[PDB]
Ligand binder design. Sequence first.
Ligand SMILES: [Zn+2]
Length: 280
Amino acid sequence: RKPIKTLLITGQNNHNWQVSHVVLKQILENSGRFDVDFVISPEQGKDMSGFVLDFSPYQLVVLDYNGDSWPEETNRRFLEYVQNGGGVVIYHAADNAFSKWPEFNRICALGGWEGRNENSGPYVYWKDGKLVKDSSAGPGGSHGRQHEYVLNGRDKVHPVVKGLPLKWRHAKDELYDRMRGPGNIRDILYTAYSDKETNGSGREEPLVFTVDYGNARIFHTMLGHAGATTEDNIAMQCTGFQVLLLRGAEWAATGKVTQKVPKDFPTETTCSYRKDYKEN
Ligand SMILES: [Zn+2]
């Protein structure tokens, strides 16, 4: 089969996007299943009027961006792409972007920072065997110290998770917690316990899920805080991070996952890595 034509939007981010955009392209392209094109925006505070994107050649859009609003024509074309059954991957702090764009916050379902709070929408978390909405006052977006943590599968059937272990240890990373937004989650794939003694929330927080937005296939992964270099980048070098990105990207583009469960998938107790961003 022909590789999946992918557009990766970057150029502004409070995170080290210079590292993450390169690594995201390598993870996807090293599988031989994706052909990735970068679009790099002007820097923060520069004229954005020329950052006019064409979504028509692509089956998948990967967001690695936060900061200045894209120009109105790009915003209109992005919404048209999504509403026409487009595939989207929301990666880590891309869900912080465009706090004042209602449509964008519905595409992410949950976001954080950029002044979000109870005015941004409810908390959504796992409580006593299901997702619950909680509109109580509080901050929109937090995380504790970076740490290894165990992801809990909440879906056994979804193409992205089918065949993967129910529990697996993710490499040292931030654990996003107290995220807020319209909360229109379609399928919850993975949650993790955010321990208060790691400066967490105390809740079982959603970290990997799909979003209910018309006929769009939206894969949201809050994992993968970018390291300072492509070599020292533990959260993204995690095999779990990479396998979920590859499967989520394939699913978002085509509605299906044709990738077998790899032999190097992490266990509940032991992290696994692909330091060079390839299954060898
Ligand atoms: Zn981060």
